[PDB]
Design a binder for this molecule. Structure first.
Ligand SMILES: O=C(NCCCN(CCCCN(CCCNC(=O)c1cccc(=O)n1O)C(=O)c1cccc(=O)n1O)C(=O)c1cccc(=O)n1O)c1cccc(=O)n1O
Ligand SMILES: [Am+3]
Ligand SMILES: [Cl-]
Length: 177
């Protein structure tokens, strides 16, 4: 039992897909350098820490995707599968039935140059609520003011105000394996 209120998800027409997506080149470790979404809230008290996400391309061309987070003084690992969707660079979550409440989960790689930066769009419906986010990935923990501003401009184009955009603080624990 609850009430909640969310900024509506954008139409998918407003979310570009990276042209000629190269699944092999996208593999390896990415740091989460920016986050924006209808459940992202800039929280001064307890700032969001950076985490890392590792993409491994399997034989069947799905990804095994592993996120590594520092929480409660430990390294925490979240492993899931991205299954190729309706065009290259688009995916759905594998084994959706195994996640209670979850009815849909879409990933779309918006842009990347494979060896420095990427922006990836996610949309999920859980308990009948529609969440969306944009993740800014870096191959390193830093990215430029310019790239941050581009991410902010893109996020705003999807209806997000500035207080729904955060830049996680770089850390050294866990994520530099
Ligand atoms: O609104 C979104 N995100 C911002 C709030 C994140 N958060 C606060 C942080 C929680 C900490 N964790 C979660 C790590 C563990 N997770 C899970 O066992 C899990 C299982 C199944 C689906 C799923 O989504 N998760 O996370 C991350 O930091 C983390 C790292 C990497 C990828 C990732 O996805 N997460 O969350 C939430 O509580 C939340 C609210 C609403 C939806 C939602 O999925 N989550 O996780 C969102 C929109 C659309 C797809 C989507 O996956 N997300 O997260
Ligand atoms: Am999530
Ligand atoms: Cl991620």
């Amino acid at each position: 039992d609850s009430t909640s209120d969310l900024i509506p998800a954008p139409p998918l027409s407003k979310v570009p897909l990276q042209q000629n997506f190269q699944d092999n080149q996208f593999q390896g470790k990415w740091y989460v350098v920016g986050l924006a979404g209808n459940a992202i809230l800039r929280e001064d008290k307890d700032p969001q820490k950076m985490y890392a996400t590792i993409y491994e391309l399997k034989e069947d061309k799905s990804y095994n995707v592993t996120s590594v987070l520092f929480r409660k003084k430990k390294c925490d690992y979240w492993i899931r599968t991205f299954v190729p969707g309706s065009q290259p660079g688009e995916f759905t979550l594998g084994n959706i039935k195994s996640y209670p409440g979850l009815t849909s989960y879409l990933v779309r790689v918006v842009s990347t140059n494979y060896n420095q930066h990427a922006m990836v769009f996610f949309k999920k419906v859980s308990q009948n609520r529609e969440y969306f986010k944009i993740t800014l990935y870096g191959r390193t923990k830093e990215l430029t003011s310019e790239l941050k501003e581009n991410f902010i401009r893109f996020s705003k184009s999807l209806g997000l105000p500035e207080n729904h955009i955060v830049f996680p603080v770089p850390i050294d624990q866990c994520i530099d394996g």
